[PDB]
């Protein structure tokens, strides 16, 4: 019935302005609920940001009070978030939420799907690849556009292959690693090569791994 949907840019350069909009379907903003925003930095807990009533009344998290702005809009039945002077700490999954508020209590019953914004000043960049000489694998170090694909000896070796999730470093570049466990006897005969593809930067490289 009543649903919440986020929208807005999923990328903002540092010192820029994050702008999100939550659209309300199957119900009117004119209810006596407070329309709030909550965020979850990847791997961390929940953090309340602020709430708004349909009259325009606002209430903001004090640690963020200076640079937040929550506005309502009944003409298109949505309510917006604007976070300025964004740092890297603002990289988080952003959920708009409906808040039932009594005289003494407040809680969230309805949530939106949630959208991820990543605060990075970066440019499409071919990933640099380094060999982890032996368990063995490759290290993918500096590429900004997210989707990177790793295969091992073409699409042949798929037994005991693990590609770890990417991580966002301080510089704004992504990094990940893919490891495989192999017999400590097959070293001499088999020749191992790891294949990395980065569709946005249009990079396709193969690296051979050899203990030194």
């Amino acid at each position: 019935q009543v649903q919440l949907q986020e929208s807005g840019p999923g990328l903002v350069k540092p010192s820029g302005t994050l702008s999100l909009t939550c659209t309300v379907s199957g119900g009117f903003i004119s209810s006596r609920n407070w329309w709030s925003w909550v965020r979850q930095p990847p791997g961390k807990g929940l953090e309340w940001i602020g709430e708004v009533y349909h009259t325009g009344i606002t209430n903001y998290n004090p640690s963020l009070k200076s640079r937040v702005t929550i506005s309502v809009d009944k003409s298109k039945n949505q309510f917006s978030l604007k976070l300025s002077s964004v740092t890297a700490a603002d990289t988080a999954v952003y959920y708009c939420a409906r808040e039932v508020v009594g005289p003494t209590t407040g809680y969230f019953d309805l949530w939106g799907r949630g959208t991820l914004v990543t605060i990075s000043s970066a440019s499409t960049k071919g990933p640099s690849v380094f060999p982890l000489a032996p368990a063995l694998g490759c290290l993918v170090k500096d590429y900004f556009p997210e989707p990177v694909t790793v295969s091992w000896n073409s699409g042949a070796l798929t037994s005991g292959v693990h590609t770890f999730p990417a991580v966002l470093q301080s510089s704004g570049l992504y990094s990940l690693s893919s490891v495989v466990t192999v017999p400590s006897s097959s070293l001499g005969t088999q020749t191992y090569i790891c294949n990395v593809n980065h569709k946005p930067s249009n990079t396709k490289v193969d690296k051979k791994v050899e203990p030194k």
Binding site: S128, S201, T203, D206
Partner: protein, 56 residues
Amino acid sequence: VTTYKLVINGKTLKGETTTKAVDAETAEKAFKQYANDNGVDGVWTYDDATKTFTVT
């Protein structure tokens, strides 16, 4: 701005990549950073019709 390509024919590294630049000399500097960042050291050749670099 235009887009240039590079072919890598190194010992353990072999592949291709792209960047965007206004002149080929600036692109040459960009690909030189990439090759060094991955340890490749070789001989550079250039083809202007295909706008493609290649180091061996």
